[PDB]
Amino acid sequence: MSPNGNLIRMLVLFFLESELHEHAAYLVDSLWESSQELLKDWECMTELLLEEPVEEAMSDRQESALIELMVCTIRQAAEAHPPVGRGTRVLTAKERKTQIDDRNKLTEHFIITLPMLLSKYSADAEKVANLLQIPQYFDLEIYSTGRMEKHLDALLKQIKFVVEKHVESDVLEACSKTYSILCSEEYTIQNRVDIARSQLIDEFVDRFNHSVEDLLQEEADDDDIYNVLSTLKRLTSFHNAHDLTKWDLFGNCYRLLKTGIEHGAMPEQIVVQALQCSHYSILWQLVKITDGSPSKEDLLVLRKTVKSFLAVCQQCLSNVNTPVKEQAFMLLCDLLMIFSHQLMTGGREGLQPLVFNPDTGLQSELLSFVMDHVFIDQEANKIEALHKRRNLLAAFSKLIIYDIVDMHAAADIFKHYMKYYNDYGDIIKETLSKT
Ligand SMILES: Cc1csc(CNC(=O)c2ccn[nH]2)n1
Known part of the structure; x- marks a missing residue:
């Protein structure tokens, strides 16, 4: 009760204080065979995280570690296998029975307790992002079974508060994915979740639009910039996993980018988000057109949209801020692959009007960026900025293989x-072998 509480408090301390386990998941996995009963005392953990002390309170850093350890135990219980990296996977009758009973316990428990956790830690972006990894393990049917509607309402309230308070890409993305899970995974609660979501979106599209109008009519305030960027971020996050095409977001994104090419003075993060958002609008237009039975004019409206956006990305390679060039480059290399002749695979030869061959000028600019921004002369930030340039080249590599860019001019650069x-x-x- 408090006995298991002590063991968990010290388990958190051994984790943080020793560098004998770098990864929370690997610690939990290793103790799992011998300490399963303890590591699945979820009532004990939420109790530590939600109660006020008598004495000795938990430190912000130890709270963080307990949440991270808790979430790993929740995974290992639900999946009933070691985490990615410690794998090898056939369950016995009793292992299977244990997995079902465990999924039951943690669902009933966290449906009730996850809103209370999100309430308390609502401003701690790292912590909220970690808590929102939990619903993916829920036995969602139980939101109906337990007449537990009141607690689905509570989680949706708390996700709303988080999204309204936060702009960090991890938080928002965690909110996006939770809606996705809550929505399309059980029909019973699908309708309830959909109403909460689209009201959330509605309130953010109104605020975005009023702020776009404010920025462009204006001299332009620091408030005008915050308001556009802050709202655009929430909408960009969500527009990956949610089809927000019913709100014409591409329209205002397009103006923001046109204004930032013309007068050249649009803040770098607005341009990056405006590009990402526009991209996600187009992918979702493409899906409705593939799966639909589209007309000639449907195809030609999406084409005009795509040619104007490829134009914007091409222009945005010349933006002073390298984060924009990178974003524009990444999108060029996706779009040019997607609206290639591959688009006429699987008997979909209706799509020919959507096919796009990059001109010489554009091909030459996609060569330039590689010489200027992949291949550069000159801690943790650099192993990361290397993997990016790797991904940027790998995305460009695909265009070379299918001759979408000049394959010869490319390999010349790889010679140099x-x-x-x-x-x-x-x-x-041979020199390095003999030392
Ligand atoms: C047909 C075609 C495709 S690109 C091209 C000429 N451009 C380059 O080769 C280049 C190298 C560095 N920057 N640009 N000709």
């Missing part, structure tokens, strides 16, 4: 930058 490997590498290789 590999020269020292081809001129001195054998000599460097």
